[PDB]
Design a protein around this ligand. Structure first.
Ligand SMILES: [Cl-]
Ligand SMILES: [Cl-]
Lengths: 578, 578
């Protein structure tokens, strides 16, 4: 499914705005913005911590002239289970809170009249949705009848609601359903190879440069476009060409356009190559999180975040720990930021080797089935973005378990089959010698928190422990390694010398000592600090109103270590043969 | 041993000030203030976290006229093992970091000349000092040779150094060594009964009121002083009489004076009676802790703290979790603040029922021997302060263990034998039905943290859980109950609605809901919030630069809940028949 875009042949109507909202088995509505998480909008603590079904409702008018058009209703994201009703008719259901879903609804609309859309969203986690969790009953001596808790083991808050825009769009009855683009370098040219999915068959395809000059054209539902003297897309030079696809049939006419970038990505030895040059990742793990709206899409915050990425000198980030909005990937295309996009397989770990995760009752064949469908949906959505340069299949799963090996072999095999054009990783906090899964990926991503979660407060252990660990990863697997997470919680304004945990000084010193180690290791091709910004988590005595490891505050202002990273990364080239 | 006080017959020389300081097996000195903890004075992180022996050194001059006087060298406190050298001569050794020690040193001084005092202090904890801990060797795959950690399980930082003043004082060769005072009410009079310890035998004892009027006198080494129409000491009316003791012998003359207060304390049924009226404790658990100086005595901070106690309307505190400086008790006498003074038996708990504490290898007969000596030293020091109204033998020990019963039976039995004039408690976090120790004390003190350490964030459980729990304490033991701790960490300036853990709002709402429960229970005779002020702890992912449960910041300014308590406690009488 293609991102909804207006053209000569397609209308788009955005239903974002103020909706009516209620919780299960309640008749009274309140007002609720869309897109947004509902948790922080009100002062009702029982809604903040609500677990169950909520219902959104809105009126909309369909123009009579949309008859004899396809009418699609698209929901960008709703966490985690959703059902969509048009005038009381169920038009689609969806499982998974971080990818879009849509249905054709012309059969159910009142033309030239009022219509009602209702969207049910259920935030109840189970062990066969990603990320997983479990609702548990607690009726003991200290809890009243009916006390229940939603348990989950990922470290970000279970925000719920409609997190990305709801839109209605039209197409002709015979229309461009999808297309695939692959770019190759050939002699002094680039090739853009394409295939179009449609019931139609007569297509003209045109490629235009930045100045609207036509640089290539082809008649054909599949084909190759040759670009002589191409300008390649890469961090530091985000050149985009505009691909125009025109269906020209007897009764149907359809146009779809997308900006694409010409680049190659390849792993060879201990090098991560973009356009055949050795890349060095400088960046962050991020989160879709901001004040008040929770996980809701906000283009103000998105553009602010990319300007901060360019300001600090980052060239990349990982979409920890789930696919982000398409909007963020289009921006990464424009700004020239390399993206590792990650499936929502986070929380597959009970920090305890006595509780097994990959076992009947928890992560099983049903979870695997969902994970495989997720990879198919994710690659289908994002396969044409130049900014996505790697897929991450999971974050900190219990990869030391025997059952994790067969599980992830299947996930990894399916991902590569779906997209052979990008490398694959998995983000590990398991010990190097214990993971049964990292031997199957292209690039190793390791999260390490020496002197924070272990030997807390003792910065002196970092060089000893980190160098020994990373050398063992390389000795066992002989793959490029990204230090995919490291950092320390810092309360803005907490200062100390000597540095103490939770101060800005400790965060900067820890990060500084980690990267001094990486500079001595020629097989380390990247550093991603956790996290870009402070974000909300569930409440616990270990979380000082959320996770405070941001390099920026939640309102997008820098802590001390942001300036250290700006100075370091201004000296580090994007392409660096270590 | 009596607090050093100048008189017509006694000189006092305070050696506090700037000393030279070094660590073990090092020849170079730095400067170090005394009294103070050494940990936060410098920018040397290796001294902040030092474990082992440190050495203080200072020159002093003895006047030739001190010949034929006793010369005593007193150390107010040094944590935790100490040795005192005068001109290289060992004059005393001491075990325990929170009580004073002294020696007579006239045999070792150079009269009319320079002298050198050196004090060794060792902060290495063991299982037979209080509070206990253990130095552990960690030489594994991730730690270099010689890595060691001091483990301990009490929740305050192991500050070390000379924490209370070092002084030298003179007495005549035959002198007042000690005295005991007990006050009784009789008809319309009060009696002050006394006994004096001395090699002398001829004494005149005089009692003076606030205006220096003599109200009673007696000739005798022991005797009774009758005060007609006494003004009693109590919170809200801290009347002090001055007791003057004069030794009058042939060759020796000695005078010692102390302010005393006339009051009785008695537990009867579910009432805590002071001067036969039902008291209600309003107050705090405190700590000896302040910026930069750690646990060092500071009279500025002490007077500030008492003015804040009076401002907020408190009438009491507990010396969590160790005896405080004598200076603080003299101030509590002046201000009329009731003190529960506690022995340093904190940390006798490995939050884990698989690791036993009262067992060979940990808390054993050697620990018990030290605990019993501590109770003797503590009562000998503080027996004459009107402000001390109860002894606490421990805080949050593993009282569910079989071995804890015999241990504490002996501690409690010895405490009562040493001082039958004050009730005894033990501060519990064990479950009511599991403690094997609370049945042996006079008043129950229970620490409860519902919605903070358990059901974190859910304020709705408080009333259900706390009322059920406290009713079970009373049903099992039929004693008065003090809620001796409850509270929540709050970062100053962290605000939210709805309230979230670590915000000022959550701290206030939790405390408000707890005390609403207490008001409905006629057997609850007290509320002590944890803590008076933010204080330092060892580093851990659960401590945001120390413990943030203070009602005041570490620099002694109020958080939101301080104003809630001021308003509540301004409405609650000190004496309240519930
Ligand atoms: Cl983290
Ligand atoms: Cl606490």
């Amino acid at each position: 499914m293609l991102y909804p875009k207006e053209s000569e042949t397609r209308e788009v109507k955005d239903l974002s705005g103020v909706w009516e909202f209620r919780t299960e088995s309640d008749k009274n509505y309140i007002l609720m913005p869309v897109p947004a998480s509902f948790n922080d909008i009100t002062q009702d603590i029982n809604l903040r911590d609500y677990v169950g079904r909520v219902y959104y409702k809105k009126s909309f008018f369909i123009p009579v002239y949309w008859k004899e058009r396809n009418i699609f209703l698209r929901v960008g994201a709703a966490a985690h289970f959703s059902e969509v009703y048009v005038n009381g008719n169920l038009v689609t259901k969806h499982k998974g809170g971080f990818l879009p879903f849509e249905a054709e609804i012309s059969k159910f609309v009142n033309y030239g009249q009022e219509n009602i859309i209702e969207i049910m969203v259920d935030n109840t986690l189970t062990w066969d949705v990603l990320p997983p969790g479990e609702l548990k009953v607690i009726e003991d001596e200290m809890h009243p009848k009916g006390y229940k808790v939603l348990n989950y083991y990922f470290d970000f808050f279970n925000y719920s609601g409609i997190h990305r825009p709801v839109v209605i769009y039209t197409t002709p009855k015979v229309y461009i359903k999808d297309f695939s683009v692959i770019t190759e370098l050939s002699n002094n040219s680039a090739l853009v190879k394409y295939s179009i999915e449609s019931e139609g068959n007569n297509f003209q395809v045109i490629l235009r440069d930045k100045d609207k000059n036509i640089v290539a054209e082809n008649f054909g539902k599949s084909g190759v476009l040759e670009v002589k003297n191409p300008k390649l897309w890469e961090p530091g030079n985000p050149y985009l060409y505009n691909l125009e696809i025109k269906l020209l049939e007897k009764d149907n006419f359809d146009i779809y356009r997308m900006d694409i970038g010409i680049r190659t990505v390849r792993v060879e030895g201990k090098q991560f190559l973009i356009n055949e040059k050795p890349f060095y990742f400088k960046g962050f793990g991020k989160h879709e999180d901001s004040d008040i709206r929770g996980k809701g899409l906000d283009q103000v915050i998105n553009i602010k975040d990319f300007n901060l990425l360019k300001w600090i000198g980052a060239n990349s980030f990982r979409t920890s720990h789930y696919p982000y909005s398409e909007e963020i990937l289009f921006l990464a295309d424009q700004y020239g930021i390399a993206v590792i996009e990650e499936a929502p397989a986070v929380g597959l770990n009970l920090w305890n080797r006595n509780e097994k995760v990959f076992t009947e009752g928890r992560v099983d064949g049903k979870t695997l089935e969902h994970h495989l469908e997720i990879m198919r949906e994710l690659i289908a959505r994002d396969k044409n973005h130049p900014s996505v340069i790697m897929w991450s299949v999971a974050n900190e799963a219990a990869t030391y378990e025997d059952g994790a090996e067969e599980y992830f072999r299947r996930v990894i095999e399916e991902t590569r089959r779906l997209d052979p054009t990008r490398p694959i990783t998995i983000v590990e906090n398991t010990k190097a010698s214990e993971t049964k899964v990292s031997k199957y990926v292209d690039v190793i991503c390791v999260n390490r928190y020496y002197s924070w979660y272990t030997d807390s407060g003792d910065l002196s252990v970092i060089e000893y422990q980190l160098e020994r660990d990373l050398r063992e990863w390389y000795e066992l697997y002989r793959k490029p390694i990204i230090l995919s997470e490291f950092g320390a919680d810092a309360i803005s304004g907490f200062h100390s010398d000597p540095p103490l945990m939770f101060t800005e000084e400790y965060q900067q010193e820890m990060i500084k000592r980690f990267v001094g180690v990486l500079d001595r290791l020629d097989f380390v091709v990247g550093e991603h600090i956790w996290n870009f910004a402070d974000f909300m988590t569930k409440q616990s005595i270990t979380r000082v109103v959320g996770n405070k490891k941001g390099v920026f505050t939640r309102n997008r202002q820098p802590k001390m270590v942001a300036h250290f990273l700006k100075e370091r990364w201004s000296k580090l080239p994007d392409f660096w043969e270590k």
